[PDB]
Structure formats: C-alpha cells, structure tokens
Coordinates of C-alpha atoms and ligand atoms in Angstrom, one line a residue:
Chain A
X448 CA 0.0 0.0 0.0
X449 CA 1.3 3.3 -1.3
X450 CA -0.4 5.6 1.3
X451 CA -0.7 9.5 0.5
X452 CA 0.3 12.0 3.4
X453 CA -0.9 15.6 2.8
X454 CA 0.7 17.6 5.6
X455 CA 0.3 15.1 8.8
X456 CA -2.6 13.6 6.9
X457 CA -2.6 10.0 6.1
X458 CA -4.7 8.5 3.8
X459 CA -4.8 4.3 3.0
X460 CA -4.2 3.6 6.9
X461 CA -6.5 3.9 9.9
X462 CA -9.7 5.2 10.2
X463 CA -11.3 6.7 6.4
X464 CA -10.6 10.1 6.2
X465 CA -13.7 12.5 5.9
X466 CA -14.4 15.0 3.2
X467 CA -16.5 17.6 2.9
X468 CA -17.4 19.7 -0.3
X469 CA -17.7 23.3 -1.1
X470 CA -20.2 24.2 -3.6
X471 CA -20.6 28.1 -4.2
X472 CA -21.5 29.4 -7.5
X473 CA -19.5 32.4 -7.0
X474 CA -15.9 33.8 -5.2
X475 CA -18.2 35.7 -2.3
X476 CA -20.7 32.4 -1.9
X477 CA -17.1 30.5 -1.9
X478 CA -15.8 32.7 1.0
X479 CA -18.9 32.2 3.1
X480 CA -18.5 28.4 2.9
X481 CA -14.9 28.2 3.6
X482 CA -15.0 30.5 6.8
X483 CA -18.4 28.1 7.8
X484 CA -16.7 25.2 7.2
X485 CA -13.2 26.2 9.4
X486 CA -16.0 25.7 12.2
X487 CA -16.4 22.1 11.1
X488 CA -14.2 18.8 12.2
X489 CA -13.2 17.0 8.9
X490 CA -10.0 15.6 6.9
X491 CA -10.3 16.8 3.9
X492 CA -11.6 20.1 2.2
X493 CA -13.0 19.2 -1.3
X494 CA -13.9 22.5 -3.9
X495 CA -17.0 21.5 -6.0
X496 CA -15.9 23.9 -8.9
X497 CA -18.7 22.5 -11.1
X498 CA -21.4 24.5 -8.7
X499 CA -19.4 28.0 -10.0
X500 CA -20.9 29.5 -12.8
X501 CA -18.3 31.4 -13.9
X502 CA -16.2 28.5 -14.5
X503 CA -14.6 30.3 -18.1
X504 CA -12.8 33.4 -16.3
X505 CA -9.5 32.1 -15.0
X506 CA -9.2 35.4 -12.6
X507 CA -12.5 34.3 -11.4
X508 CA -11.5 31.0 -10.7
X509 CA -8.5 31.9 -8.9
X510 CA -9.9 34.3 -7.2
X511 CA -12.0 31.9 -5.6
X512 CA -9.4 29.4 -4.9
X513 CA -7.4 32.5 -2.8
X514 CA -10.5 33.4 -0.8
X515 CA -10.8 29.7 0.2
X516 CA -7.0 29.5 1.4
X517 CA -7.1 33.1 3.0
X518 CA -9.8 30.9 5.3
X519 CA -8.3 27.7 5.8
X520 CA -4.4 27.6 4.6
X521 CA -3.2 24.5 5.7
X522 CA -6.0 22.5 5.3
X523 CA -5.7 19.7 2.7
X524 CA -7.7 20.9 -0.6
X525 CA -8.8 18.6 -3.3
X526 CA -9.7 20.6 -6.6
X527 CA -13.1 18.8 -8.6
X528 CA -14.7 19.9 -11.5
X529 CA -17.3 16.9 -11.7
X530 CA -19.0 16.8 -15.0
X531 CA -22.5 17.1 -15.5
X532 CA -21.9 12.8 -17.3
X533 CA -20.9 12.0 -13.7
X534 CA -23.3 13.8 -12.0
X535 CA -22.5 17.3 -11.7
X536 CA -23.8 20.5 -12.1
X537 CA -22.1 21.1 -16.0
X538 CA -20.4 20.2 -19.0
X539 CA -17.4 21.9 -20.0
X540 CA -15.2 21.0 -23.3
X541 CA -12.5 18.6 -22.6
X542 CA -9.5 21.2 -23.5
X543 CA -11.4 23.2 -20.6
X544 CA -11.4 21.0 -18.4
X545 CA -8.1 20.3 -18.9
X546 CA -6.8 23.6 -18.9
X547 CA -8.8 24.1 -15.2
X548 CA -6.9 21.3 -13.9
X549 CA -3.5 22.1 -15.1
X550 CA -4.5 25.9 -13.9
X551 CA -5.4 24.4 -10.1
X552 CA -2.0 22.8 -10.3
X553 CA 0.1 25.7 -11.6
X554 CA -2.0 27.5 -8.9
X555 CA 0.2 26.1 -6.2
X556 CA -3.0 26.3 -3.4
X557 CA -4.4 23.1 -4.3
X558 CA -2.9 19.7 -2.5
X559 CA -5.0 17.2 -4.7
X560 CA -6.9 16.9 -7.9
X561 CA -10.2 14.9 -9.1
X562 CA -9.6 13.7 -12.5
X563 CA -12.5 11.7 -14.2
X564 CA -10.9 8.2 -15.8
X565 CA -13.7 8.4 -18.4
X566 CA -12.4 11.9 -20.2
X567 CA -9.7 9.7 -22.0
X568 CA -6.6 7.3 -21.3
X569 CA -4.4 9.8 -22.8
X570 CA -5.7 13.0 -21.8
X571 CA -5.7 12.1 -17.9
X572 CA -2.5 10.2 -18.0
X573 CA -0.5 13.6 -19.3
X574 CA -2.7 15.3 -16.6
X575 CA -1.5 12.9 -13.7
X576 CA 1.7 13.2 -15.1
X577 CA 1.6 17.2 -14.9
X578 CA 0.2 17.0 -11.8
X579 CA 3.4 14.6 -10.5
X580 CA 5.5 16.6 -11.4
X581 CA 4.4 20.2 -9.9
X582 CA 3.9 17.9 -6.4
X583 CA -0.3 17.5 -7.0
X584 CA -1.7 14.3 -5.9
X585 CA -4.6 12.5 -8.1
X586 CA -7.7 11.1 -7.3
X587 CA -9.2 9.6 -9.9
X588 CA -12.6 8.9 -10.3
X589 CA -15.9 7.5 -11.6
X590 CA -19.5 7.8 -11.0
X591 CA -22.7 5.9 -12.6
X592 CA -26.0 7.8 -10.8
X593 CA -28.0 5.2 -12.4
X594 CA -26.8 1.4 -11.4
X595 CA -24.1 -0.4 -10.1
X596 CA -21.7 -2.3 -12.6
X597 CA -20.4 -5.7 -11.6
X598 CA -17.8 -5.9 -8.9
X599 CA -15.9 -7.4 -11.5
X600 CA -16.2 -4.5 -13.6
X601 CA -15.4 -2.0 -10.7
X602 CA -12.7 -3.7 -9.9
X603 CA -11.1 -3.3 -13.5
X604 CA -12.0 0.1 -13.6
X605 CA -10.3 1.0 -10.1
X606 CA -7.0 -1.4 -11.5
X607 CA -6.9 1.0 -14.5
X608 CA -6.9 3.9 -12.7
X609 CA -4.0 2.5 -11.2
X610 CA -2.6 1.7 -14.2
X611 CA -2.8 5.3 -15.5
X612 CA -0.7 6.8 -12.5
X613 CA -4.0 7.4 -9.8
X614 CA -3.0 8.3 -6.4
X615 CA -6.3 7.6 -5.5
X616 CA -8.7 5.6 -7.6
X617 CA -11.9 6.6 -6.4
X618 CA -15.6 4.9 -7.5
X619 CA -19.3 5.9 -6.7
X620 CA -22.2 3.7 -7.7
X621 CA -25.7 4.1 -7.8
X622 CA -27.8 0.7 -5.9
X623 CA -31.1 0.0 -7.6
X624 CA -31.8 -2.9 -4.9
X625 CA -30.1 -3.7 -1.5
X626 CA -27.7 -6.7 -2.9
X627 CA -26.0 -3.4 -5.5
X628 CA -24.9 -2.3 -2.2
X629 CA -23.1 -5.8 -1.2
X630 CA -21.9 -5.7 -4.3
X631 CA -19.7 -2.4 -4.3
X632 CA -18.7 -3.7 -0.6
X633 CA -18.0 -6.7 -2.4
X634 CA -15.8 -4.6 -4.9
X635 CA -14.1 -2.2 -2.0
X636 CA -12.8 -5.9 -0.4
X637 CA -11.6 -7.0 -3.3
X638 CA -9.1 -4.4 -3.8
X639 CA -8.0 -4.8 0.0
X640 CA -7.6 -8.3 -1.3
X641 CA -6.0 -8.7 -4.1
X642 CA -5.2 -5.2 -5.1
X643 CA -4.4 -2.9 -1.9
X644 CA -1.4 -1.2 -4.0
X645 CA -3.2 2.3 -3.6
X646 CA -5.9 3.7 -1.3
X647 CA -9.0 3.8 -2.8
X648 CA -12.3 5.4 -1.9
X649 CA -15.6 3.8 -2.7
X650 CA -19.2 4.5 -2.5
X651 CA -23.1 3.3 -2.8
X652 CA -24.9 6.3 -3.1
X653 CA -28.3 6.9 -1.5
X654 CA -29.9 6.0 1.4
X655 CA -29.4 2.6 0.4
X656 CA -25.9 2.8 0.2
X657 CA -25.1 4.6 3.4
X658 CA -23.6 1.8 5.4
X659 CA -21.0 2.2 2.4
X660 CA -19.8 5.5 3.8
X661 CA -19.6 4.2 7.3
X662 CA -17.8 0.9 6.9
X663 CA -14.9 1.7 4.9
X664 CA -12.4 0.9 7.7
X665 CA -13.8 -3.0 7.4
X666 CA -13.9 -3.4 4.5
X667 CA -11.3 -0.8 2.6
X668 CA -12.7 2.6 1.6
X669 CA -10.1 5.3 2.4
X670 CA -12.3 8.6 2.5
X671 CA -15.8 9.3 3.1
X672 CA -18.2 12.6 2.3
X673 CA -20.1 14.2 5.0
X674 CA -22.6 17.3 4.6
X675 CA -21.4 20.2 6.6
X676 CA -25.3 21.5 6.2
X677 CA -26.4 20.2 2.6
X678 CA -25.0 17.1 0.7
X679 CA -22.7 17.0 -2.0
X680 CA -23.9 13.6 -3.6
X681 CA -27.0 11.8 -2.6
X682 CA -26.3 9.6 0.8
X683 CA -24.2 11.4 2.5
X684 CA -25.0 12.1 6.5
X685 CA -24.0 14.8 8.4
X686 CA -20.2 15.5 9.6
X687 CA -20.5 14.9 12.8
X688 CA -22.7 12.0 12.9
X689 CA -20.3 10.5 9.8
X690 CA -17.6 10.9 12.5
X691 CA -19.3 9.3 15.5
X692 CA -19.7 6.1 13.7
X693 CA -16.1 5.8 12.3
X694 CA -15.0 6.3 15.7
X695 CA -16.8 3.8 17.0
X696 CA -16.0 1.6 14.3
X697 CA -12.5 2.0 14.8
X698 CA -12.4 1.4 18.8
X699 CA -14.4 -1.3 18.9
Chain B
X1264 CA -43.3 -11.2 7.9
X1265 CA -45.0 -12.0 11.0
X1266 CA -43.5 -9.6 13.3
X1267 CA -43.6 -10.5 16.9
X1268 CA -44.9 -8.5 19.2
X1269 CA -44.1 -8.2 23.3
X1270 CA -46.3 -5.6 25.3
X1271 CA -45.5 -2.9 22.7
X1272 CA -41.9 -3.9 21.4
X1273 CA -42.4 -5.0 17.7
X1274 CA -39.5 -7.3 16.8
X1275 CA -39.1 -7.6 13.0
X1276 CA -40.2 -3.9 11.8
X1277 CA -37.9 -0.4 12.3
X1278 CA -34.2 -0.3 13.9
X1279 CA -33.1 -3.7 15.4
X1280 CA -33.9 -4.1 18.7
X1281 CA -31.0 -4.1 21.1
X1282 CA -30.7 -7.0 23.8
X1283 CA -28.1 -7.3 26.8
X1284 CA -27.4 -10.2 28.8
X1285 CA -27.6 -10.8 32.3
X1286 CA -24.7 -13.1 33.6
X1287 CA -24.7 -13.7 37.2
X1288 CA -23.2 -17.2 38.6
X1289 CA -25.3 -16.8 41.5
X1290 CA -28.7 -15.7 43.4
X1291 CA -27.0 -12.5 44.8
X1292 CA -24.9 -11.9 41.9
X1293 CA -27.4 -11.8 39.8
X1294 CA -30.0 -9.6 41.9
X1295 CA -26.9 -6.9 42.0
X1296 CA -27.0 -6.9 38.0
X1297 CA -30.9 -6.5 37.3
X1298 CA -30.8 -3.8 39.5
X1299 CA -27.9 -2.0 37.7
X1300 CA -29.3 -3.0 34.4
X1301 CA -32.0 -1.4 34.8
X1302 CA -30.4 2.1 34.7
X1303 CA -29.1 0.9 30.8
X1304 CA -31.4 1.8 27.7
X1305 CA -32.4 -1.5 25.8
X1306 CA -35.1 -3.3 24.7
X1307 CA -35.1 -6.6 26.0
X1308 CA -33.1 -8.3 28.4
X1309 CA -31.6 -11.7 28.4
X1310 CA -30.9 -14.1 31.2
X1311 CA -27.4 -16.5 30.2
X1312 CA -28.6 -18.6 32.3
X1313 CA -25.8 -20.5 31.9
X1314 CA -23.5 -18.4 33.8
X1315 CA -25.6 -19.6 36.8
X1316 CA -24.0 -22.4 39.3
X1317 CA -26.4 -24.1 40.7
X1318 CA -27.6 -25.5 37.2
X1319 CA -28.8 -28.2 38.3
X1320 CA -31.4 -27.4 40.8
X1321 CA -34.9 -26.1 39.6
X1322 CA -35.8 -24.3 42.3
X1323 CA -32.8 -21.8 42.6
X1324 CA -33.0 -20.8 38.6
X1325 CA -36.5 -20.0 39.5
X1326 CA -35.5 -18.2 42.5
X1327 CA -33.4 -16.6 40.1
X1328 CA -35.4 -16.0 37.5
X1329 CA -38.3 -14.0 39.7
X1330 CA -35.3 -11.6 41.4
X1331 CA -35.0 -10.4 37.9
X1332 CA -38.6 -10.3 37.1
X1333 CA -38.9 -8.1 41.1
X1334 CA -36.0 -5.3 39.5
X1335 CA -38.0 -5.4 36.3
X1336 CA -41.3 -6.0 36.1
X1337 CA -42.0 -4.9 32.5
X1338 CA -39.2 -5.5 30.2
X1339 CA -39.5 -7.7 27.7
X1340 CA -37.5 -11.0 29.0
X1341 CA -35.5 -14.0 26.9
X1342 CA -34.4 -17.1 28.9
X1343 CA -31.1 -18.7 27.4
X1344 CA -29.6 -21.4 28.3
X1345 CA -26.3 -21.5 25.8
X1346 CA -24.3 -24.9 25.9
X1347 CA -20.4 -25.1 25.8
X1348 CA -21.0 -26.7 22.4
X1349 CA -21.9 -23.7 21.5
X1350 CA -20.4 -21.1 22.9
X1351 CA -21.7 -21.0 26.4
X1352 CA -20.0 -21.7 30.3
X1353 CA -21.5 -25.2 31.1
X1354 CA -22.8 -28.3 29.6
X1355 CA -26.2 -29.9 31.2
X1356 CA -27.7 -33.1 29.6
X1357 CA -30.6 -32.4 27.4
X1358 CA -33.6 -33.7 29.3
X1359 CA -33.0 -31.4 32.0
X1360 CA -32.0 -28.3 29.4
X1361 CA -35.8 -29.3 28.6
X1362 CA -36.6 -29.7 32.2
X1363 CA -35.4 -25.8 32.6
X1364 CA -36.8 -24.5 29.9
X1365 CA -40.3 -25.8 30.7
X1366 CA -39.7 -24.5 34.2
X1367 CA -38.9 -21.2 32.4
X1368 CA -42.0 -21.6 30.7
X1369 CA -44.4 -22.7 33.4
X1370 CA -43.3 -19.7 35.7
X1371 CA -44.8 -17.2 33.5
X1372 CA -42.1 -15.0 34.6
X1373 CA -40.4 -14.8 30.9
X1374 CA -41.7 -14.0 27.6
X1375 CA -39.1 -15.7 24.8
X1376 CA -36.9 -19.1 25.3
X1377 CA -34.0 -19.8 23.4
X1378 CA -33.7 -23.2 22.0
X1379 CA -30.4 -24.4 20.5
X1380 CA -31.5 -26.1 16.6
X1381 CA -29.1 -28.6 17.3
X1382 CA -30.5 -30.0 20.3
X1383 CA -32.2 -32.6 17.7
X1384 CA -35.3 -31.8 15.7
X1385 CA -38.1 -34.1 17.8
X1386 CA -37.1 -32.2 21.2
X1387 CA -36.9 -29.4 19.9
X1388 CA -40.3 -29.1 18.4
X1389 CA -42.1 -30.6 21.3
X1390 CA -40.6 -27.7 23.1
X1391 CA -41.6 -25.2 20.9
X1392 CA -45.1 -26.5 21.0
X1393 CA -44.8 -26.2 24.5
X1394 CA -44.1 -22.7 25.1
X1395 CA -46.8 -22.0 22.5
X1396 CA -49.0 -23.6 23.8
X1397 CA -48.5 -21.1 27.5
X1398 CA -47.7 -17.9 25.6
X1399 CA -44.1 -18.1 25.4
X1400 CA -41.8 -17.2 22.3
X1401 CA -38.9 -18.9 20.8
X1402 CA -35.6 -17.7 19.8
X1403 CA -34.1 -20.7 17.5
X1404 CA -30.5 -20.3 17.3
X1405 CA -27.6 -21.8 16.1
X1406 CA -23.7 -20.7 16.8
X1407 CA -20.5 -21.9 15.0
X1408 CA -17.5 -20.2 17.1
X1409 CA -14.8 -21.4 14.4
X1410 CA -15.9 -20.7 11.1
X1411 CA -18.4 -18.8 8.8
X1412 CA -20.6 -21.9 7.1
X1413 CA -21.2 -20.4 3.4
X1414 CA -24.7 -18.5 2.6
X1415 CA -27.0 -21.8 1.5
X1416 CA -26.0 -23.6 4.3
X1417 CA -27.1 -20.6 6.8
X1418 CA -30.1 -19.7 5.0
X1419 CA -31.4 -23.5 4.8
X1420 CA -30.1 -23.1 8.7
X1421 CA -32.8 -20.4 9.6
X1422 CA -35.3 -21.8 7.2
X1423 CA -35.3 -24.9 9.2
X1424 CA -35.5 -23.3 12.3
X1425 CA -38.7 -21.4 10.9
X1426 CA -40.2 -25.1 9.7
X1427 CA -39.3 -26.5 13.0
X1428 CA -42.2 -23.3 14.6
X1429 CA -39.2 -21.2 15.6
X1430 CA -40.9 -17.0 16.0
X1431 CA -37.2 -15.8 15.7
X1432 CA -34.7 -17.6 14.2
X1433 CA -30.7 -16.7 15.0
X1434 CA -27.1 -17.2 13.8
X1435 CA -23.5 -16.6 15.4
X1436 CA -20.9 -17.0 13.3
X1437 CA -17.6 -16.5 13.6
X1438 CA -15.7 -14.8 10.3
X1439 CA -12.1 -16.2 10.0
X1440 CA -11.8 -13.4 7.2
X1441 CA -13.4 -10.0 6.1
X1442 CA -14.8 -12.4 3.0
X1443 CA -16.8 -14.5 5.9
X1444 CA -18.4 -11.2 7.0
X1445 CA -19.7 -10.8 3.8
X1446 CA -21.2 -13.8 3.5
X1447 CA -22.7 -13.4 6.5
X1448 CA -24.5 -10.0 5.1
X1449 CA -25.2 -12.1 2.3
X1450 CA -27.3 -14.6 3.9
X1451 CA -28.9 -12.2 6.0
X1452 CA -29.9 -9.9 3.0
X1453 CA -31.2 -13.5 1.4
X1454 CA -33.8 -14.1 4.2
X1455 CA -35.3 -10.6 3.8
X1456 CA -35.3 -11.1 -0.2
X1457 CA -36.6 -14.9 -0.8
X1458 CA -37.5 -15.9 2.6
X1459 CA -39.4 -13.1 5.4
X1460 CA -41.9 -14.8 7.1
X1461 CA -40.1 -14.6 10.1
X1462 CA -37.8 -11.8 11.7
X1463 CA -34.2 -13.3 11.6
X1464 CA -31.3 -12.6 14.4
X1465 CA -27.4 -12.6 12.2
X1466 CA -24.6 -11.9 13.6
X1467 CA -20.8 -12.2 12.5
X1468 CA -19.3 -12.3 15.6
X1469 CA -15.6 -10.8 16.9
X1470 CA -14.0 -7.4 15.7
X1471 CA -14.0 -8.3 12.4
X1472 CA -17.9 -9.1 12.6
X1473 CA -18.6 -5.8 13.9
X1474 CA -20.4 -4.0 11.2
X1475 CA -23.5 -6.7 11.1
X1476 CA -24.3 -6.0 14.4
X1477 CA -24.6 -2.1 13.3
X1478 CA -26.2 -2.5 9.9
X1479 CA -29.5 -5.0 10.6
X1480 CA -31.9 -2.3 9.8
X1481 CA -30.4 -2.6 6.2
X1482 CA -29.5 -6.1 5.2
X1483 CA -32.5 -7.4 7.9
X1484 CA -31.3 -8.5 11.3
X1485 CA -34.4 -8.1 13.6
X1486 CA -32.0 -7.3 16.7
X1487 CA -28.3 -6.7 18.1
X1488 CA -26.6 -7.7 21.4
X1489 CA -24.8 -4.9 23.2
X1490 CA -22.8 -4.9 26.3
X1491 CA -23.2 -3.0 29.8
X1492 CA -20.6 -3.2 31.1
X1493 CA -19.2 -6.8 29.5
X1494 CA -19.7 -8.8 26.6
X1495 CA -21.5 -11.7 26.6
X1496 CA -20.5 -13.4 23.1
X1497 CA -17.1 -11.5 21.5
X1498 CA -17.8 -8.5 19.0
X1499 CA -20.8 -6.7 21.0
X1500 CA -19.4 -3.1 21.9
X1501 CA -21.0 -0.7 24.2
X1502 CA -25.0 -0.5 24.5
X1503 CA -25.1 3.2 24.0
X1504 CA -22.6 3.6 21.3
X1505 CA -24.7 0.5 19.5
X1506 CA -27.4 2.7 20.0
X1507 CA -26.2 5.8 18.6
X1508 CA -24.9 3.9 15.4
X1509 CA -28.7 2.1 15.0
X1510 CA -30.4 5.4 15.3
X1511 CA -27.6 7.6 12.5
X1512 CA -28.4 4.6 10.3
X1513 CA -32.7 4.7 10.8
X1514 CA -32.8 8.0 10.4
X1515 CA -30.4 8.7 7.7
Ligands
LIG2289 C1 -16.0 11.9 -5.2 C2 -17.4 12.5 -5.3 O1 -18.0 12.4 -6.6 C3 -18.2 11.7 -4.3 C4 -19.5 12.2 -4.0 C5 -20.2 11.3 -3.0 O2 -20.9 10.3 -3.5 O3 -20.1 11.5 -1.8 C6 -19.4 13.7 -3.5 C7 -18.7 14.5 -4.6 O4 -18.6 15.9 -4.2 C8 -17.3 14.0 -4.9 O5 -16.6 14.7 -5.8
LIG2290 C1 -27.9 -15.2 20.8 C2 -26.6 -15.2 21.5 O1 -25.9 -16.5 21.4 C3 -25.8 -14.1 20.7 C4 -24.5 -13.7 21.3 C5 -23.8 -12.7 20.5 O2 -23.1 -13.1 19.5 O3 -24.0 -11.5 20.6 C6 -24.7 -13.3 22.8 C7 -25.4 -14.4 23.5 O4 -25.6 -14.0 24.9 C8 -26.7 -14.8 22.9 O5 -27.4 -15.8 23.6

C-alpha cells in the first residue's frame, strides 16, 4: 500500500478520512463556505468547482481558490470539477477542463486533484503526469447515478486507474436494490484483497448505500463525504454524525 | 413477515432491537446486576442462564429468575440457556436443558426461550409447541465459534429453524476473514429477499464481525446484542454507542 500524506494527513491507513465539499457558485458564496466550514471537524476540504458559474474566467476562478485559502491555509484541498456525465452541475469541453486542472495545479493552493478516468486514457494520463511533477496528488474517479456495474467490472475500472498513475482511484455507484450495495462492498474488499497497492475510496450512493460510507475501515474505503449542512452527492450524512460512527468503528 | 410482538416492542419492523445479557453465577450476583441494568437503555433483556451455578437445581433458577422479574417487572424477557458446544460456560444433559426450559415456561415470569436447533429436531419441536401452547416465544439459534458456514448452508439453517415453529430464528458466526463477514451479510440480505416470514437474528461475531451488528436495519437483522458493562459473546461493543450507530443509520 502506497499511502498519501498531505501535511500530517494519512490517507490508505486507519480510520477513512472524511471530506467535505464546497459548492458556491460564486468567489463571495465560496468565502462564506470556507469561513463556515473552518467551524467544522473533517480531513479533507474538497472545492465543488462545477457549482461556480463562472467557470470560463480564469481570474475568477482563482480568485475563488485564494479566498478559500485566505480561510483555511493549511487545510488539505482537493480541486473537482465533476462533470455534469458524472453527475455534476455542468459540461465543459475537454480542452477546458483540462486547462482548469493544469490551472489548479500551476496554482500552487491546491494539494489534490479529481480527475474523471472516463475523459480519455491519454488526456488524464498527461494530466496525472503534470500534476506529478508540480507535487499534486490524483484522485481519480468514476461515478454511474443510475446502477451499479459488476464488482468485477469495478474492480477493473479501479485497477486501470491504477494503471494510469492514480493516487487515489476513487468509484461511486448508484444501488437500484439492496444486494448493488453488497456488491460495491464486495468490490471495496476485493481491492484490499488482491489489489491494496493504492488507497482507494468507494461508495453506494443513496440511502441505500449509506452503510457504504460508514464501513470503509472494514472493509477498505479510504475517505468518506459528509454534509457540513447540505450534501454533495446523494447519501451522504452529516459530519459529525459520519464521525461518531467511524470512531466507534474504529475502537471497537 | 409475521412480526412478533411483546407488550408494545415489535421485533421484526424499524431499527433492530438491542438486547443485553444478564450473567450472574449466582442468586445475589445476579440480583446486584438486574438492579444496575436497569439504569441501561435497551429493549429486552436476556438471562445466560448458563452463567448460573447451581444449574442443576430447579428451584434456585426459578429463584433466580423472579429476582430479575422483582427489578424489572416490564421489560420484555428471553431465557437462554447457551451450551459449551456452542459457545456457552456449562454443559447440562438435554432432558433437564428441557426440564429448565419448561420450568422457564411454566413460571410465567419470561416472555421468549432460546432453543439451541441442534438439540435434535423431535425435542426441539415438542418444546416449541410447549411454550406456545402457555404464551411463550422462541428464539431458535444456532452458533458456530470457528468458522463462517457459506450462505446456502445458513439460510437452509434459519429456514429450518422457521419449519421446526421457531418466531425468531438466529445465527453466530464467527468470520475467520473479512470475505466471511460478507457472507454473512449475504445470507442475511437473502432471508429478507426470498425468505421473510419470520424476523431473523445474524450476527458475524468478533471485531471483524462488527459492522453486522450495526447494519440489521439494512440487510434485515431483527435485533443486536450490546454490552453494559461486559460482553457476553465476542464482537458486541457498548450499548449506548450501538445505540447511537442504529439510530444515525434509521434516520439517515
Ligand atoms: C467523489 C465524489 O464524486 C463523491 C460524492 C459522493 O458520493 O459523496 C461527493 C462528490 O462531491 C465527490 O466529488
Ligand atoms: C444469541 C446469542 O448467542 C448471541 C451472542 C452474540 O453473539 O451477541 C450473545 C449471547 O448472549 C446470545 O445468547
């Protein structure tokens, strides 16, 4: 297991690190979240970018990634645009989407960032590569909002990710019936398995899915979302209550 | 399902119902721990009756018996006798393991028996008959404290127990592997899919077991042990912070 330390942080060992997500469609809505959220216990700070709307103006864009440093500098901050395929709030070209990413990393204020496996072998493997080298870590990720794949499937997916120079292969699934949810458990233990080379973080969304958020120290998620006061992605619970069960988890 | 029902707890519907266990090897012992369990939050209480002694005698398990009932009139109360063979502090031949449990039955001072599956089907039916016949419920159960039997063979465990009249039937298991847990869930889910007539008790025991005592409410186990202030089987953690998980998870 290749574990990833941001600061003090250490993720792929001991109880999953908890994220939360900033989702302001503009640099003062951005500022208001970040100096909420410094009020808030949690592991990891993650920037929704997809909620801003003016995603096209790169002063704009850093702008907003200053404010949310002036609030909370030492903080570990993962940079996501998710697109609007994946589940977010909208679509931007890939060259865009490229360009924000290499822009976060240039940037300098952001520790990690999401990059969607699906945008293209090539196109993310330069991208990781970029990111290397100017000291960014990857997660890289996947979502389906309408079904689960086979664990079989997942598993692949989360290899490849590997395979392409992930940090952090990441995957969230939607269950249509209770056994989806054994099945991305099923997935998640697989990798601990047979595959524990990187951390990885996994997910069933929904209310269905929750105990996938909570049990990830049994069965081999590394991170978990929590709501500071609305969710990021359907399932998630509130922080704190997120936190109370992984601590029990883990002292049992 | 046919839920069952004891003043107004409903076993089989909402969050698991949490039980503790009384262990007391004596009279005085165990009138010092009804007293203090009753200043715990559960929903019904069960007496391990073979923590007591003076097994053999009738009389003093009665005795026994109504010092619990005197510290707590009202709470909804399971006799267990568990044998060494499964997992329990003393072996007794079976007639008088019938014997007790008749007593247990006849005193009208308990409202559930457990009855061990593998006592041998003729006995075990006669008994069940028997405390049906004076108002009494049965807990089937079955315990394997070496190894995780796979899915089938649990399922067409508990199905048994349900043919044989059992109201709730239960399984222990004990995972040698993270895999086992999961088969354990798996099983579990497979009763609530194909096979809900009856509320089922599962339970993957140890720390590794640990999550399927939190997560019946999703993959269908009717109820969860908890401990006061000790365990009585390994892999039950505190009662409150059970409770606390049970209730993030119902009202997620
Ligand atoms: C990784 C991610 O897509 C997971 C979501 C979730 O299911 O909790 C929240 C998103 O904000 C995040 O980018
Ligand atoms: C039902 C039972 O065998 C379950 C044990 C457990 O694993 O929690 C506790 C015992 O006290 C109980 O009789």
């Amino acid at each position: 297991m290749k574990t990833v330390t941001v600061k003090n942080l250490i993720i792929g060992e001991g109880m999953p690190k908890i994220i939360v997500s900033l989702m302001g469609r503009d640099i003062n809505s951005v500022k208001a979240e970040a100096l909420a959220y410094r009020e808030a216990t949690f592991d990891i700070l993650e920037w929704r970018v997809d909620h801003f709307m003016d995603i096209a103006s790169t002063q704009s864009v850093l702008t907003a990634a200053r404010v949310i440093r002036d609030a909370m500098p030492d903080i570990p901050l993962l940079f996501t645009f998710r697109s609007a395929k994946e589940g977010g709030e909208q679509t931007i070209t890939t060259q865009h989407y490229l360009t924000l990413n290499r822009a976060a990393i240039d940037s300098g204020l952001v520790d990690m960032i999401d990059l969607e496996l699906f945008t293209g072998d090539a196109d993310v493997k330069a991208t990781v590569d970029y990111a290397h080298a100017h000291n960014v870590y990857v997660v890289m990720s996947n979502h389906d909002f309408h079904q689960t794949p086979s664990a079989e499937e997942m598993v692949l997916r989360l290899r490849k990710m590997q395979a392409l120079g992930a940090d952090i292969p990441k995957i969230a699934v939607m269950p249509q019936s209770k056994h989806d949810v054994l099945t991305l458990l099923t997935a998640t233990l697989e990798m601990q398995q047979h595959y524990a080379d990187r951390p990885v973080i996994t997910m069933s969304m929904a209310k269905e899915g929750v105990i996938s958020r909570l049990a990830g120290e049994v069965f081999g998620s590394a991170a978990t979302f929590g709501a500071v006061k609305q969710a990021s992605a359907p399932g998630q619970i509130a922080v704190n209550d997120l936190r109370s069960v992984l601590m029990i988890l883990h002292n049992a």
